[PDB]
């Protein structure tokens, strides 16, 4: 009964047989990781272990762009995009 | 056929018969919306139309917390959590 992590098993059970890939595009990866971590469900073990495929530059820019998009949407919601 | 929006149809077709709820917790909602918008897939029509259930305060704080978590993870990745 050694489950690696319920996060990946979720993705495995998703639909029927999920594709448990370590991702590639940091947008997709970080979006998925964000979706997990910001909701409540702990990110997949390999994420906390090796961050999948996060290089400490492009992924950083990805995060920057992410919070930028968030700031834009925040501006839209609060400021009505002025 | 007249497809409302491929985004919701995705969620409909997901697994078998997805639960097309307008969400409730802004964390879940915004996480889902973020996952969509940051990846590439346009957010569900009702999101661009009425933002689902976004009130221009708690959702704003949700966005703040989101970009905060992003900044924290960014700090972890780049600064190694100092």
Curated annotation (Swiss-Prot), chains A, B:
Highest taxon of the lineage: Viruses
Location of the protein in the cell: Virion; Host nucleus; Host cytoplasm; Host cytoplasm, Host perinuclear region
Stretches for region Hydrophobic: 19-54
Residues in compartment: Cytoplasmic: 2-82
Function: Plays a role in virus budding by binding to the cell membrane and gathering the viral RNA into a nucleocapsid that forms the core of a mature virus particle. During virus entry, may induce genome penetration into the host cytoplasm after hemifusion induced by the surface proteins. Can migrate to the cell nucleus where it modulates host functions. Overcomes the anti-viral effects of host EXOC1 by sequestering and degrading the latter through the proteasome degradation pathway.
Subunit structure: Homodimer. Interacts (via N-terminus) with host EXOC1 (via C-terminus); this interaction results in EXOC1 degradation through the proteasome degradation pathway.
Protein name: Capsid protein C
Entire-sequence positions represented here: 20 to 100 of 3391
């Amino acid at each position: 009964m050694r489950n690696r992590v319920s996060t990946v098993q979720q993705l495995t059970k998703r639909f029927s047989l999920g594709m448990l890939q370590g991702r590639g595009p940091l947008k997709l990866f970080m979006a998925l990781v964000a979706f997990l971590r910001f909701l409540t469900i702990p990110p997949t073990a390999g994420i906390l272990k090796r961050w999948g495929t996060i290089k400490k530059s492009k992924a950083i820019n990805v995060l920057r762009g992410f919070r930028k998009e968030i700031g834009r949407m925040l501006n839209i919601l609060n400021r009505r995009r002025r």
